[PDB]
């Protein structure tokens, strides 16, 4: 065709992105992966989401784990590949060995097992095809050399086929060789890596597009979470910066902070606030997520620094009934620790709650948490993710971050983050004559015009009281301000 | 010859200048690299450039890729070698394994295969020549040694045939071995590494030329981006020191700060807005964008934080129509995260949009916000990148920054850039009485005079309103000011 490549929908959850549209019809895909790193599952997925989505037959062949527990495994996703076998859509081609034994089983072997593929591929009439393990095919007595012409002689003849392919192979090291003899990397098209880092003590997945021959890819990892779906990719780097934005307002829980932003948050606008340990940042949040029940809106509550009691008690001493919040339907909380899964985790968790209860705010307390351990980066990109999400999608979410340093914060961020948010609320304690006192101001707003009063404020039993500002003071971003004026009153 | 190695065009962007002029003729260039950095496409571009521009004819020896693929791929780039084989100018050397089974055809090796080529050359009167993965030829069973002789036979071979050369080699260790059996880097009179680096879940293609026995060339790394339009490259280090400059000057859309500036800024000038987050470094952009439309002027404005419906909100809220503007094809949007691309990447999307808008006026709001997870060097030669070429292209940019912290921060840029820009405008915020009030201050100009004082400003509806100064304060810089009765 004078057309270039095209490309097969996989319905894999951002793979087609990454892939841009998919894997090139027509060419086997190289999928290789340390052990454990889902290569198998992702053939499934392909063969599987072809058949219930494009009614696309699919061959698989496997020279490792019988078809049955295959099939078991399956299940783990909800997938009865057992059916679309039945059904004439899939067909398992056995090619392992026997658990009896026979001798000289390579001359033969891969020739006579593609003219076994093509009866398969022919007569199913498929347009599908993985092979699971070609690297255990090889793993016999041979080197090198023989390797290389032997996946030539099979990624053509499959060519000749002219089915859309997926081959998968195994690693050794993390990020040492691509492939085992460190051949098929060429002998091949196009080489998907999924890796299983480890960094740490949590491992965080990525998938990788080393190239796709002929056509366009994202380059680059990006991390996937295998679930009860099957595989699920984020492509954070391809989150396009078109997010709608209203008008509207709505409230922050406390109507004198509903002032000091120029009437209320945006609906569409991302909301930090930040204090050193103990300002307020959970009386807000609290505020906050009540607010959006009293007129009947959904909205989470994140939490990763109190539990799911505490977060009912201390609630309660402020006023306000989470507990209501709950029954009504109208309020959710989830609480985990953040040591309980990595960032790429926590992102699709939270993602998922979303979905399911379709929030109308988020109010996620710390990402101070979240930033623990995760190397500065890793973690700056989940935030983008979560505040680019939750923003193209119509949702006010209130951020938490806590000052590293009580009084003398020289940064509000402490880990910059500042930009990537759209309202900003400071809190800060205040030396006035040896009694530690709340501020609250509201640092910026982008769509309005917000109060420019550093005001003081107190914790009671009604909740917060934005009251007056300081202007008697000098050095009150200091934490320890100074009293000014030197004249009373006295005659003319 | 008793005079110089004439050199060969590649006509590949950017190239010509790292090597020089091109290849060394008459002469092989061993390129190698690891899978998916574009050995083959440098090769494919090499011979069809060749075609397009010199008339001077091909010969794609490839062992590996079939015939027919090796054209379909090119189709990728709007390239039809299935024309060029018609037309003659081009031939594909299919000398790839027979899909099914022989052992006892390649008696005659290396020799054989030499005559062929030799001959199709003879045929169409080539005048380049690429060898496309030679190592898959030896990956048969061959020792270090039985290589170097091999080659060194092809190579002269080729050399003979007063033919220029380019062989494809692959990697598998990005900053090791300079090829598979470490004989070829010796074998070869010129050698080019194509490297995609990772390093930070991302990676970057640089190219580099080893050497080239001869003549000289650029030495070390340069990024890379394969594109529709094949290997693109910039050698940031090739672009020389001569911008034409002017007194010329434009407004900065604020009739103030245009005075604060001694009467606007200059034309032919870089101009940086540091400042705290929230300082209204995004105000003083938005109003440097519209001026140029109401002096019928393309602007275009690059964006890295906010959304292209958000600006298009709060620009609103600041008087100020940005929709108007691009209707009248007077002002050009953009918008995309900084993790949306690479540096190298970013730049060239920049270059891109202004060849296709021919923009008289840049806006980059952020570059502090392109910085995220790059490497401060990698970035200042952002910097540069995009500086120099608005500079020579006669372009005024306006570039925001934000450091990583309110009040008090010593210094204007934290990644310390400063030095590269002509023109800073400086946002700052200063604690006065329980309270957070602006403050803008022109700190240098190279051409001008500019106000040296901190004038407080506050913004709404209708803009950015320079006041007067703190006379009676001391250290507004700090931040938190000491009123002096
Ligand atoms: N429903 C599921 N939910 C969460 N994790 C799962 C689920 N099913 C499998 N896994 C995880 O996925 C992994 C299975 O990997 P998979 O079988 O897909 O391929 P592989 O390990 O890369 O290659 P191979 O098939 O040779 O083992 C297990 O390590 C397990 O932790
Ligand atoms: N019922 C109450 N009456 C008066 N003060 C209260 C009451 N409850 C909490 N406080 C005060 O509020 C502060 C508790 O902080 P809060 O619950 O708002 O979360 P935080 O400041 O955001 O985060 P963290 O406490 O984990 O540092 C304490 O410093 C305490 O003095
Ligand atoms: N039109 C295109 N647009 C964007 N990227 C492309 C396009 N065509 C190819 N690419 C990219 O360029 C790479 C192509 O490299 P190429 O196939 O030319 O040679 P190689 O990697 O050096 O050697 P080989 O692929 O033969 O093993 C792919 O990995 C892919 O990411
Ligand atoms: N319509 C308006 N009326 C009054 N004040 C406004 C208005 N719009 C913005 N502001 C003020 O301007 C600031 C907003 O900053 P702006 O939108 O100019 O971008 P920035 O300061 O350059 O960058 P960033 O938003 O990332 O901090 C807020 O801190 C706020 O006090
Ligand atoms: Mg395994
Ligand atoms: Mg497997
Ligand atoms: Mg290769
Ligand atoms: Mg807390
Ligand atoms: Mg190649
Ligand atoms: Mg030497
Ligand atoms: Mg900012
Ligand atoms: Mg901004």
């Given at each position: 065709?004078?057309?270039?490549?095209?490309?097969?929908?996989?319905?894999?959850?951002?793979?087609?992105?990454?892939?841009?549209?998919?894997?090139?019809?027509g060419?086997?895909?190289?999928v290789?992966?340390?052990?454990?790193?889902?290569?198998?599952?992702?053939?499934?997925?392909?063969?599987?989401?072809?058949?219930?989505?494009?009614?696309?037959?699919?061959?698989?062949?496997?020279?490792?784990?019988?078809?049955?527990?295959?099939?078991?495994?399956?299940?783990?996703?909800?997938?009865?590949?057992?059916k679309?076998?039945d059904?004439?859509?899939?067909?398992?081609?056995?090619?392992?060995?026997?658990?009896?034994?026979?001798?000289?089983?390579?001359?033969?072997?891969?020739?006579?097992?593609?003219?076994?593929?093509?009866?398969?591929?022919?007569?199913?009439?498929?347009?599908?095809?993985?092979?699971?393990?070609?690297?255990?095919?090889?793993?016999?007595?041979?080197?090198?050399?023989?390797?290389?012409?032997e996946?030539?002689?099979?990624?053509?003849?499959?060519?000749?086929?002219?089915?859309?392919?997926?081959?998968?192979?195994?690693?050794?090291?993390?990020?040492?060789?691509?492939?085992?003899?460190?051949?098929?990397?060429?002998?091949?098209?196009?080489?998907?890596?999924?890796?299983?880092?480890?960094?740490?003590?949590?491992?965080?997945?990525?998938?990788?597009?080393?190239?796709?021959?002929?056509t366009?890819?994202?380059?680059?990892?990006?991390?996937?979470?295998?679930?009860?779906?099957?595989?699920?990719?984020?492509?954070?780097?391809?989150?396009?910066?078109?997010?709608?934005?209203?008008?509207?307002?709505?409230?922050?829980?406390?109507?004198?902070?509903?002032?000091?932003?120029?009437?209320?948050?945006?609906?569409?606008?991302?909301?930090?606030?930040?204090?050193?340990?103990?300002?307020?940042?959970?009386?807000?949040?609290?505020?906050?997520?009540?607010?959006?029940?009293?007129?009947?809106?959904?909205?989470?509550?994140?939490?990763?620094?109190?539990?799911?009691?505490?977060?009912?008690?201390?609630?309660?001493?402020?006023?306000?009934?989470?507990?209501?919040?709950?029954?009504?339907?109208?309020?959710?909380?989830?609480?985990?620790?953040?040591?309980?899964?990595?960032?790429?985790?926590?992102?699709?968790?939270?993602?998922?709650?979303?979905?399911?209860?379709?929030?109308?705010?988020?109010?996620?307390?710390?990402?101070?948490?979240?930033?623990?351990?995760?190397?500065?980066?890793?973690?700056?990109?989940?935030?983008?993710?979560?505040?680019?999400?939750?923003?193209?999608?119509?949702?006010?979410?209130?951020?938490?971050?806590?000052?590293?340093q009580?009084?003398?914060a020289?940064?509000?961020?402490?880990?910059?983050?500042?930009?990537?948010?759209?309202?900003?609320?400071?809190?800060?304690?205040?030396?006035?004559?040896?009694?530690?006192?709340?501020a609250?101001?509201?640092?910026?707003?982008?769509?309005?015009?917000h109060?420019?009063?550093?005001?003081?404020?107190?914790?009671?039993?009604?909740?917060?009281?934005?009251?007056?500002?300081?202007?008697?003071?000098?050095?009150?971003?200091?934490?320890?301000?100074?009293?000014?004026?030197?004249?009373?009153?006295?005659?003319?």
């Amino acid at each position: 065709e004078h057309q270039a490549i095209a490309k097969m929908r996989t319905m894999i959850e951002g793979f087609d992105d990454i892939s841009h549209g998919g894997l090139p019809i027509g060419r086997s895909t190289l999928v290789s992966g340390t052990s454990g790193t889902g290569k198998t599952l992702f053939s499934i997925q392909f063969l599987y989401n072809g058949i219930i989505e494009f009614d696309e037959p699919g061959v698989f062949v496997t020279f490792e784990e019988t078809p049955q527990d295959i099939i078991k495994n399956a299940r783990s996703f909800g997938w009865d590949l057992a059916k679309l076998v039945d059904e004439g859509k899939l067909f398992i081609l056995d090619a392992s060995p026997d658990p009896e034994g026979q001798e000289v089983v390579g001359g033969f072997d891969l020739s006579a097992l593609i003219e076994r593929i093509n009866y398969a591929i022919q007569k199913y009439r498929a347009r599908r095809v993985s092979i699971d393990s070609v690297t255990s095919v090889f793993q016999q007595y041979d080197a090198s050399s023989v390797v290389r012409r032997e996946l030539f002689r099979l990624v053509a003849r499959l060519k000749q086929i002219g089915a859309t392919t997926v081959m998968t192979t195994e690693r050794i090291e993390e990020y040492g060789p691509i492939a085992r003899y460190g051949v098929e990397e060429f002998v091949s098209d196009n080489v998907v890596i999924l890796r299983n880092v480890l960094e740490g003590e949590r491992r965080r997945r990525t998938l990788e597009i080393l190239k796709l021959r002929g056509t366009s890819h994202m380059k680059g990892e990006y991390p996937f979470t295998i679930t009860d779906h099957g595989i699920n990719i984020f492509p954070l780097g391809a989150m396009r910066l078109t997010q709608r934005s209203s008008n509207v307002r709505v409230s922050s829980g406390v109507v004198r902070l509903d002032e000091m932003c120029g009437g209320g948050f945006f609906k569409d606008s991302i909301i930090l606030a930040t204090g050193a340990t103990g300002t307020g940042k959970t009386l807000l949040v609290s505020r906050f997520v009540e607010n959006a029940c009293a007129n009947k809106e959904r909205a989470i509550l994140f939490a990763y620094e109190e539990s799911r009691a505490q977060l009912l008690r201390n609630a309660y001493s402020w006023g306000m009934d989470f507990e209501e919040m709950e029954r009504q339907n109208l309020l959710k909380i989830v609480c985990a620790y953040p040591e309980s899964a990595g960032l790429e985790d926590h992102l699709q968790i939270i993602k998922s709650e979303i979905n399911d209860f379709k929030p109308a705010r988020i109010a996620i307390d710390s990402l101070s948490a979240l930033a623990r351990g995760v190397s500065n980066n890793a973690f700056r990109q989940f935030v983008i993710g979560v505040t680019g999400y939750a923003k193209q999608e119509e949702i006010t979410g209130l951020f938490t971050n806590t000052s590293d340093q009580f009084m003398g914060a020289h940064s509000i961020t402490d880990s910059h983050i500042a930009t990537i948010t759209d309202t900003i609320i400071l809190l800060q304690y205040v030396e006035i004559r040896g009694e530690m006192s709340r501020a609250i101001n509201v640092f910026k707003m982008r769509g309005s015009w917000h109060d420019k009063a550093i005001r003081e404020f107190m914790i009671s039993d009604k909740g917060p009281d934005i009251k007056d500002s300081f202007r008697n003071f000098e050095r009150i971003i200091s934490g320890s301000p100074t009293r000014i004026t030197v004249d009373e009153k006295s005659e003319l």
